[PDB]
């Protein structure tokens, strides 16, 4: 037993399990009612609906509501989504012990401690029916999964089976016209206290406090004020079917059947919760949890967990399996047993499930294993780890125990374990708790064989006969020898391709998919360890790593195919579909699409024309179509998507033709881009394009520098003026030098107020007159000879080239 949930609330008189969802309601003696998401751990609601004890609690899930009944003497209906009181109704004139909801119309049943249980119709003004019989308290009313009948447990020493659509109960003799009820000695003795009798049941244990059913059985068990539990047939009122379970020490508050085990779980107002044998009907074992007394019990009609309410609070407790072994063939999931019986196949986003016949497991699973050709299933039965049990083989597409006993298919024989192994019809078995090999002599092997033995490892489960004592050991087909042992880190699972020759093992990042023995074919790219993923024999690997099913790869493409609304494990890939089942084991299926897959299959084979159609909004994203296609240094993909002003910018430098850059740079509304593309421009060779860019980034001085280098003199002058005003002394200043005469500087420098510098520059060119002007306007003294000349010839022949390097030739490829 595992404790899923345990919240101390104080004395819970009523407890009920939601049939739709894995929720619990508790009604407390403190007058508070609480609705719990016991799996999620999130309080849904909490209401103080009455000062004193609220003894009865129910789900009213026909429309999303819960119903409570309290000692206010009322049955009240409550919203769990809007937290408001939907409707209020007069159940009775005393304590509402248990309440039950009709699924016919919004009718509500309340069982009370004033000896009647009544059903009331809100939708109309009518109280449709009152069901009477008790002479002392109806402690409990309980639904079967059909809505026609209810059972009530009362402390007048009976259990009364009622009809809710009926006036009290509904029955009529076909052998007589007279009423079924007799107040006289007939073939049984009872009073006149009913309209008619469909079924008056024993409840004698000095009154039964509660009654409840197994979800798939008409049988009911009742706990009563004494110290016994008595199991009843409510479908016949037999007294040759009723066995008494003895173990408890004081008044048993309830007893209900465990849906998922072959035991009956009871709880009593002593201090113990006792567990009972349901093939022997006496106490297997007693547990004390020391929360003292238990006044309520509950068994899940959604066959999830199990719960019992105590005087400290309640516990929902777990007797279920986690991470089961499974394999998918074409449309059949085969898995190892979990709650809610056998399920699987169909759906794709819903948490509903539905049945198909593909049970790999139909008996206690010692082993469940697929054939490597996927044609048989081996199920090993009668448990044990001694040296013998039974093993039953089933056919894989549709599974029975035996298909026919008169046909080779579906046979059984002895063997502690038998598990299939490669050569694709073979199996290896343990029948002495050694490794023995199994043949039948042609077809998938069903018959027990004793030759060949080993002295290492110990029988268990597998798919290649896994055995453990310190590692997971693969065993051979026809040899006693260990084929190989694997040791690695796991996430509690073993993943098969679908063929059970091969195995996938989980590692520190993702999963690795491997062949028979331990040989690693490839590694799935993905940062974290996947929960499960399976390969369609190889190639197309589909996996779950969250709430979505995505392909690790198909033909070098990468895609997330679709998301489901639940966390899940891939069951495996056999066919185009991928099939999944989770811990609770609800299915999702998903067709492998030609969405993400076609697009990149096409882009890889350099098709852009194909790819435009392929572009859809089921796969567009942001960077797999509209900006992933700007990721070629010799643009190809890049040419195709260029819609973003940034992608356009990028495209241009990758070609080296910046004509497009300037425009993208423009449409990026930014200077930085113009200077950087201008530099790239100078690199392709041509300075016209550089000028334009550099002019608008305002790098007139860079231009001034560039310009004799380029051999322009006309353009070089334009730069000088528009750098004059900036007082860029390594911009405006340059150009005068660069033309044969220096006069440009002389004026700019005059405006700077740098009269000295202006004179020196001018004077040397033999423009002593201008040099003198500067001296005269400002401080004179021009006579001085610095570490540089102040009057020696400056003349330079400017640019001998007739065509300039703004006109640098180009062809462009």
């Amino acid at each position: 037993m595992l404790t899923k949930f345990e919240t101390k609330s104080a004395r819970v008189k009523g407890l009920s399990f939601h049939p739709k969802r894995p929720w619990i309601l508790t009604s407390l003696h403190n007058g508070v009612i609480q609705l719990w998401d016991y799996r999620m751990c999130t309080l849904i609601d909490k209401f103080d609906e009455h000062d004193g004890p609220v003894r009865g609690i129910d789900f009213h899930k026909q429309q999303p509501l819960f119903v409570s009944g309290g000692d206010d003497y009322k049955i009240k209906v409550w919203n769990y989504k809007l937290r408001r009181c939907l409707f209020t109704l007069l159940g009775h004139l005393d304590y509402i012990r248990t309440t039950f909801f009709h699924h016919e119309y919004p009718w509500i049943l309340s069982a009370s401690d004033d000896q009647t249980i009544r059903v009331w119709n809100w939708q109309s003004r009518t109280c449709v029916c009152v069901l009477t019989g008790h002479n002392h308290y109806v402690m409990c009313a309980q639904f079967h999964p059909s809505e026609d009948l209810v059972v009530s447990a009362s402390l007048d020493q009976t259990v009364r089976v009622w009809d809710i659509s009926g006036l009290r109960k509904k029955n009529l003799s076909p052998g007589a016209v007279e009423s079924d009820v007799r107040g006289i000695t007939g073939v049984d003795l009872f009073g006149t206290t009913d309209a008619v009798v469909k079924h008056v049941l024993e409840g004698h244990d000095r009154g039964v406090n509660w009654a409840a059913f197994h979800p798939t059985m008409p049988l009911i068990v009742s706990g009563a004020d004494d110290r016994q539990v008595k199991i009843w047939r409510m479908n016949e009122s037999k007294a040759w079917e009723v066995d008494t379970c003895r173990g408890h020490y004081n008044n048993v508050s309830c007893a209900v059947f465990h849906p998922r085990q072959e035991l009956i779980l009871s709880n009593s107002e002593d201090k113990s919760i006792r567990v009972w044998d349901m093939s022997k009907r006496t106490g297997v074992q007693t547990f004390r949890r020391d929360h003292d007394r238990f006044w309520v019990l509950a068994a899940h009609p959604n066959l999830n967990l199990f719960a019992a309410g105590h005087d400290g609070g309640m516990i929902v407790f777990k007797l279920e399996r986690e991470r089961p072994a499974y394999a998918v063939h074409g449309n059949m999931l085969h898995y190892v047993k979990d709650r809610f019986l056998r399920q699987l196949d169909f759906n794709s986003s819903k948490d509903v499930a539905v049945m198909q016949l593909r049970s790999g497991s139909k008996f206690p699973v010692f082993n469940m294993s697929y054939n490597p050709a996927e044609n048989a299933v081996l199920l090993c039965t009668r448990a044990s780890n001694l040296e013998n049990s039974t093993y039953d083989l089933y056919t894989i597409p549709k599974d029975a125990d035996s298909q026919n006993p008169d046909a080779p298919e579906g046979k059984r024989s002895s063997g502690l374990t038998a598990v299939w192994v490669a050569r694709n019809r073979f199996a290896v078995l343990d029948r002495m708790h050694s490794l023995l090999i199994k043949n039948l002599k042609n077809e998938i092997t069903k018959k027990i064989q004793v030759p060949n033995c080993d002295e290492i490892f110990y029988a268990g489960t597998g798919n290649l006969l896994l055995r453990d004592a310190d590692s997971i050991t693969l065993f051979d087909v026809q040899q006693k020898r260990t084929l190989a042992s694997v040791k690695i880190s796991k996430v509690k699972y073993v993943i098969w391709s679908a063929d059970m020759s091969h195995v996938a093992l989980l590692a520190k990042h993702a999963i690795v998919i491997c062949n028979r023995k331990l040989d690693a074919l490839c590694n799935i790219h993905e940062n974290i360890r996947v929960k499960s993923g399976a390969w369609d024999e190889s190639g197309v690997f589909i996996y779950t790593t969250s709430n979505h099913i995505k392909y690790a790869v198909t033909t070098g493409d990468h895609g997330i195919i679709r998301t489901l609304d639940l966390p899940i494990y891939v069951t495996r890939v056999k066919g185009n579909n991928v099939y999944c089942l989770d811990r609770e084991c609800r299915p999702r299926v998903l067709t492998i699409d030609p969405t993400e897959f076609k697009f990149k299959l096409a882009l890889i084979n350099r098709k852009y024309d194909e790819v435009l159609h392929m572009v859809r909004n089921a796969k567009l994203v942001g960077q797999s179509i509209i900006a992933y296609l700007q990721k070629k240094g010799y643009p190809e993909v890049a040419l195709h998507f260029v819609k973003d002003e940034k992608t356009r910018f990028s495209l241009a430098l990758e070609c080296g033709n910046i004509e497009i850059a300037l425009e993208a740079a423009k449409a990026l509304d930014d200077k930085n881009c113009w200077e950087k593309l201008g530099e790239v421009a100078l690199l392709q060779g041509n300075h016209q394009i550089v000028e334009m860019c550099y002019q608008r980034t305002k790098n007139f001085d860079k231009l001034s520098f560039l310009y004799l280098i380029t051999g322009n003199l006309e353009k070089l002058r334009k730069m000088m003026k528009i750098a004059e005003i900036r007082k860029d002394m390594s911009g405006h200043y340059q150009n005068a030098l660069y033309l044969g005469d220096v006069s440009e500087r002389v004026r700019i420098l005059k405006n700077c107020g740098q009269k000295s510098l202006a004179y020196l520059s001018a004077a040397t060119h033999g423009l002593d007159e201008e040099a003198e002007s500067l001296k005269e306007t400002f401080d004179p003294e021009k006579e001085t000879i610095p570490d540089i000349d102040p009057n020696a010839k400056l003349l330079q022949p400017p640019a001998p080239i007739m065509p300039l390097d703004t006109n640098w030739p180009l062809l462009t490829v």
Binding site: S546, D565, A618, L620, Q623
Partner: protein
């Protein structure tokens, strides 16, 4: 009603009731719920109906209140019009004989930048054109400016209405009370008028004139406002070497550190700075002005030095002030730090002079000897001062008191070769009363090195050699030491040769000499006897023996760089060390895209189903430290809809109460039980939530000490250095590689990174990545690195441990 968001039904009732008090209270209750930010439009017709025309100020004032904080939003009782229920009968309010209602009305009306009230606010200046108070005229200049701000930057607001429309600002200057709402964008004539007003000021008003127009030619002209600007203006006209002597800055400055010692400590700093600007060597840092309080005339009465003595501190004022003060003595006067540190140290270090400077705790005493002594090592002049003071330290003549003294002085002799010959005779004296290691160690070293100088040695050593105390470390120090210097230059009943005999016995041999040594078995395991035993080639003589070693100093020994030094005065250093200096089916497909630096989670939402999913809404959630920067906003997910919807993503937020998993993404649709479904887009980790932070070597070291990091793993793909994979990955688990903890050479040179983070997890995170990259013939495991990790309870330690391996995700839809 402090904050009660559902109470709007009661407020409507309370708002009209025939009792004026109730109405006022109601309207008041509305105000307080809106201000907090809660529900308010239901009420509007009720609110508006009583109050509208009236001159009765309180309700009017209340309604006037509610029109500046929500008028636009509320529309039941107002709707949209030019003369709304905010102002239609508030033209009456503006034109009442009572100044208060008019004034109030004017004030809110003009305050709004509302365009549905633009016309009614314009002649609203009428209400305050007549100025019954200073408040009325100020209210007017602020309201005209607020009108100007509200779309009337042209002729609707600029001239006069009858006295103000943007002209109160002019009028105020010459009127009895000033206030200029004219700070920006307003009449030039008023700006000019404010200047005139500087003279004819009104003090509150002067702060308003002054924010607009500052700098005076004068000293002042009066009032705090002018005065406050004035110190700014003064700092301009003399920037040079701080303010030096703080101006009118002094008044605010004290409050800036009201907690309480820190003000004095700061004040002391400024006063020291101010005294003089010295040489400004190592801890001689006094700036400000060279002469302004001088230093050191011999005719100055009662001198500068009296204030200088405060700064020399033992703690003479309290600890915060102490740390500042010791640095400050050093700073005004020394040679560097050395001079004034020796004086200061002489006072602090242990003596027989004062017993208020000696203590029997050995480390502090020792440290104080080392601090005094480091000054000599720094600077020569100090050697001469230190040795006689050291002998006074010894004179205490407790076992331990001698001991500490002997230990440093012996180091000083290693530096200071045959210069401290004189000390030896003093040093022997207290060596006889003995209960500790330290005394034996040190004494044996002085007496040993110094042998030529003295001749006493059999007698001194021998009382101790046959005396007891604690003797582990004694062995090591005596072993290298006892023979040294001059081969036969002693004799009392054991010459220098007896000493070499002794020296050898004490090291690890055996010999009758000095009435046998105390112990022979050496100190910590590596040291042993043997090196020295081999040694003494030439019997205790300066050559290439113990003497050589003794009269030489290991490596460089200079300054206060901590090479035979300790770095200032021992008490001040503790504080400096402390200073760390830390700086409903649904289908999803998804990829993350970045265009023009916009980071977005691309999602495509797919309805593969024929069924209805209308009611479709899309939301991205805030989980914890993950947040939506804008959810996907399309109403998509309809019958056979493919859509691309973009959800923008952030990584940095504050924890929300909903789940803390990967990324939650929510699509809504038709269904009433699961109207909202959670389905996933691709991976985001728990690691995001960590917040990056950094450490320095001191913070790293402190944290190393603070909490354990023994935990290590070796991570593959740490083959590479710190910079490459390891930094990038460490970054993603919000970590950063900072400072080293390595020790590289030709045999050493693992790369070491000191990591830090301060996780939003109630822990920090730290680690050291050691990269085992071979720098030896026997590497650990070759290339790979072992990361030694922690976090504050090592719950994030583990994150560091595995997120430094690999990490990559991609898709290509």
């Amino acid at each position: 009603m402090d904050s009660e968001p559902p109470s709007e039904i009661s407020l409507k009732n309370d708002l009209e009731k025939g009792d004026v008090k109730s109405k006022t209270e109601a309207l008041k209750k509305v105000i307080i719920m809106i201000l907090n930010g809660e529900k308010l439009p239901g009420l509007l017709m009720t609110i508006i109906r009583f109050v509208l025309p009236l001159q009765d100020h309180t309700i009017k004032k209340l309604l006037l209140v509610f029109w500046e904080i929500v008028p636009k939003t509320t529309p039941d009782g107002r709707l949209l019009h030019e003369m709304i229920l905010v102002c239609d009968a508030y033209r009456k309010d503006l034109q009442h004989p009572n100044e208060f209602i008019r004034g109030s009305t004017l004030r809110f009306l003009c305050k709004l930048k509302e365009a549905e009230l633009l016309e009614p606010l314009m002649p609203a200046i009428r209400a305050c054109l007549e100025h019954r108070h200073s408040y009325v005229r100020r209210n007017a200049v602020l309201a005209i400016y607020t009108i100007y701000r509200n779309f009337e930057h042209l002729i609707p607001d600029a001239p006069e209405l009858i006295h103000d429309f943007l002209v109160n600002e002019k009028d105020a200057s010459c009127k009895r009370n000033a206030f200029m709402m004219l700070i920006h964008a307003d009449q030039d004539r008023a700006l000019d008028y404010l200047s005139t007003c500087i003279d004819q000021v009104q003090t509150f008003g002067d702060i308003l004139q002054l924010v607009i127009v500052e700098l005076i030619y004068k000293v002042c002209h009066a009032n705090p406002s002018e005065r406050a600007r004035f110190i700014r203006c003064i700092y301009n006209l003399l920037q040079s070497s701080s303010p030096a002597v703080k101006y009118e800055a002094a008044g605010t400055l004290v409050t800036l550190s009201s907690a309480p010692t820190a003000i004095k400590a700061a004040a002391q700093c400024y006063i020291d700075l101010i005294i003089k600007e010295s040489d400004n060597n190592v801890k001689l840092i006094v700036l400000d002005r060279l002469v302004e309080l001088k230093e050191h005339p011999a005719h100055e009465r009662v001198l500068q030095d009296l204030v200088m003595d405060i700064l020399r501190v033992l703690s003479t004022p309290d600890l915060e002030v102490r740390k500042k003060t010791l640095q400050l003595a050093l700073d005004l006067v020394s040679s560097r730090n050395v001079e004034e540190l020796v004086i200061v140290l002489k006072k602090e270090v242990i003596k027989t002079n004062n017993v208020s400077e000696h203590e029997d705790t050995d480390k502090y005493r020792q440290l104080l000897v080392r601090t005094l002594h480091s000054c000599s090592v720094r600077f020569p002049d100090m050697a001469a001062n230190v040795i006689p003071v050291l002998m006074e330290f010894l004179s205490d003549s407790n076992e331990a008191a001698a001991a500490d003294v002997l230990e440093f002085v012996r180091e000083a002799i290693q530096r200071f070769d045959n210069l401290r010959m004189l000390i030896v005779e003093k040093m022997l004296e207290v060596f006889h009363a003995i209960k500790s290691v330290k005394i034996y160690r040190g004494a044996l070293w002085i007496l040993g090195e110094y042998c030529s100088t003295k001749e006493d040695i059999q007698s001194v050593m021998t009382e101790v050699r046959r005396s007891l105390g604690e003797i582990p470390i004694v062995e090591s120090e005596i072993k290298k030491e006892a023979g040294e210097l001059k081969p036969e230059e002693e004799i009392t009943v054991g010459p220098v040769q007896k000493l070499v005999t002794e020296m050898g016995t004490y090291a690890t041999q055996s010999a009758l000499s000095s009435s046998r040594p105390t112990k022979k078995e050496e100190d910590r395991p590596p040291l042993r006897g043997f090196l020295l035993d081999g040694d003494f080639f030439v019997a205790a003589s300066l050559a290439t023996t113990l003497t050589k070693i003794a009269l030489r100093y290991v490596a460089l020994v200079q300054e206060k760089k901590k090479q035979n030094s300790f770095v200032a005065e021992a008490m001040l250093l503790m504080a400096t060390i402390l200073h760390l200096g830390k700086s409903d089916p649904v289908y999803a497909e998804a990829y993350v895209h970045v265009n023009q630096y916009d980071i977005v989670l691309d999602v495509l939402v797919v309805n593969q189903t024929s069924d209805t999913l209308q009611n479709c809404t899309l939301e991205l959630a805030t989980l914890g430290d993950l947040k939506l920067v804008e959810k996907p906003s399309p109403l998509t997910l309809a019958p056979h809809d493919f859509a691309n919807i973009k959800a923008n993503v952030k990584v940095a937020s504050t924890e929300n109460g909903i789940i803390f998993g990967n990324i939650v993404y929510d699509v809504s649709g038709a269904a009433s039980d699961r109207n909202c479904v959670v389905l996933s887009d691709i991976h985001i980790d728990i690691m995001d939530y960590i917040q990056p932070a950094t450490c320095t070597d001191a913070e790293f070291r402190q944290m190393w000490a603070e909490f354990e990091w023994e935990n290590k793993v070796t991570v593959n793909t740490n083959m590479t250095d710190l910079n490459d994979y390891l930094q990038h990955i460490l970054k993603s688990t919000n970590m950063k590689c900072l400072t080293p903890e390595k020790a590289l050479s030709g045999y050493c040179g693992f790369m070491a990174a000191n990591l830090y983070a301060r996780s939003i997890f109630g822990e920090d995170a730290l680690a050291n990545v050691s990269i085992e990259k071979p720098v030896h013939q026997g590497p650990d495991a070759a290339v790979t690195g072992h990361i030694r990790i922690r976090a504050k309870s090592q719950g994030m330690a583990l994150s560091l441990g595995d997120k430094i391996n690999l990490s990559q995700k991609k898709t290509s839809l």
